[PDB]
Symmetry: C2
Subunit: 327 residues, 2 copies
């Protein structure tokens, strides 16, 4: 497997990293959304199911009705629009909510919709408030990066285990990352995302994949008909929770030799505190105001590592690509 869809000097650094760390029990960690594929799964699945009439404001779990809807002018606010208004309160409100909003569905159902969104091939209209003006924007469905496909498999082929630490629902991510048809071939147990309690409709037993994996009795098939509930399981895999997730589910002391991300605040803990001393920081640059923010982070952390008497590793081994360079 060749790093064919990669700028040549990135394919260079990455091949060197892989030769240096083949077959040594090393591991690598990837963000999913806008890192391993272009665009975002939850952000397109929400409006896509609203538009099918599958998700509607009145099916919404009452624990998620945090603030009043804004129905000014005989227009009924969409769930998409509401998500944005929560994001204005805070990331910490809106990050869980946009995983929880898919409550009430069985995994089997959600998998069918995920596959429909992946095969869709066309933008999805949504609405939202820009101040008080009702507005329009089109949301793209996920688009698998070919280069990431290549890198995931080439890491696994060289005995470097591959994990996904994503801020989106673990089970939604797993339906992309662990399904052979998308070309990642992640092991399902190595997908780490936001978790909520899964409920048995007949028995009312509550479980989660994380629970079953730690107990060594994980089989993704038997969770198919369980319902996604919104009750949150921790650690929550964003911000420092990404680093928490590495400690809890991967290794307490061995660091990843590669960490891939695209959102500065949310991926920045696993990137700066997580990556091994000589590991690669894989960055996908998709928003020039994020490029400048990450560069500001590299500077400031470099300086703060030094001032605390630590080797300066924050500026080491960046591999920076744009979405178009790996598409």
């Amino acid at each position: 497997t060749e790093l064919e869809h990669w700028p040549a000097p990135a394919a260079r650094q990455l091949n060197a990293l892989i030769e240096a760390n083949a077959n040594k029990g090393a591991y690598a960690v990837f963000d999913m959304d806008n890192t391993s594929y272009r665009y975002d799964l939850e952000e397109s699945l929400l409006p896509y199911l609203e538009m099918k009439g599958v998700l509607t404001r009145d099916r919404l779990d009452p624990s998620l009705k945090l603030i009043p809807f804004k129905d000014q002018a005989g227009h009924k606010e969409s769930l998409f629009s509401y998500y944005y208004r929560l994001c204005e309160i805070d990331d910490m409100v809106c990050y869980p909510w946009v995983a929880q909003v898919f409550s009430g569905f069985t995994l089997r159902e959600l998998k069918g919709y995920v596959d429909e969104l992946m095969a869709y091939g066309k933008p999805i209209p949504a609405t939202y408030y820009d101040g008080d003006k009702l507005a329009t924007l089109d949301v793209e469905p996920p688009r698998v990066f070919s280069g990431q496909r290549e890198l995931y498999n080439k890491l696994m082929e060289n005995g470097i285990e591959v994990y996904v630490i994503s801020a989106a629902h673990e089970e939604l991510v797993r339906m992309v990352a662990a399904d052979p048809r998308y070309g990642y071939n992640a092991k399902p147990e190595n997908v780490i995302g936001v978790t909520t309690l899964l409920k048995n409709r007949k028995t009312g037993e509550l479980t989660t994949a994380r629970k079953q994996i730690a107990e060594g009795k994980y089989d993704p098939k038997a969770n198919l008909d369980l319902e996604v509930t919104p009750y949150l399981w921790t650690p929550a895999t964003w911000m420092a929770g990404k680093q928490a997730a590495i400690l809890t589910y991967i290794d307490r002391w061995k660091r990843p030799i590669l960490v891939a991300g695209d959102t500065p605040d949310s991926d920045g803990y696993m990137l700066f505190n997580g990556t091994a001393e000589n590991g690669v920081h894989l960055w996908v640059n998709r928003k020039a105001k994020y490029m400048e923010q990450i560069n500001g982070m590299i500077k400031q952390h470099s300086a703060a590592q030094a001032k605390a008497g630590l080797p300066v590793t924050a500026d080491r081994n960046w591999v920076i690509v744009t979405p178009e360079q790996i598409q």
Copy 2:
């Protein structure tokens, strides 16, 4: 302030650390329940509130009824019983639940109950299911540890900042650790705990203390008539979340020179991954099973640090005390 309620060899080790780290920008982290005082706030407050009529299954948020209550022909399941039953599903179910259970009150009311509980001073009767049979037990309210009251102050007096990182509700913990009538004298902003969205009933505004502190304007009094809701803010401060909280709210690179704990799974991440190399692991031993569980972990982590090419720090500077010895 003098370290008088300590065994002398511990007080020597602590005084020596305080002297080596005086006015150097150092800080210390303390668990609260069963570390800073004896017994547990939430576990005594919840059944206190039940035997007073304040907190009942009716005024229980519908988002927190995850399973059916188990009523036997003549007796109604208490909230303490249901709580034990959720612990048997997973700590990751019962840990947030027993914080969220205090929802639907204002911080003013709760500050009332806490000060009451702290003054109550006597054992509270509570009931649960031992297997399938109904059982009774005596739950004790917190008793402030004089030793810890002294250590906190001696640390502040030598310009060693003091933080509290608890798996109990941040606002509950604040009401004891920051309120000077208990003698800890912790800065309100330096108390970190499990956080839920606080609601302005008037306006519908949603905030949390962590938000206000991160934004640079925090006044505890401004919050007293906000309603505690159940909606969970992260990172959740238990297990690897405690280490996540150090990164997020304290410092990304500087490590505490003192970490204090009493629960091997919940406190282990900040104890082993957090504590500075030349820091003190301060351990309150309140259960025989926990003392050997932490000794087991110390060995395991020592070996795993060496294997990973790290300096072995896990077995270093253990200050071990019983509740009795610091009471």
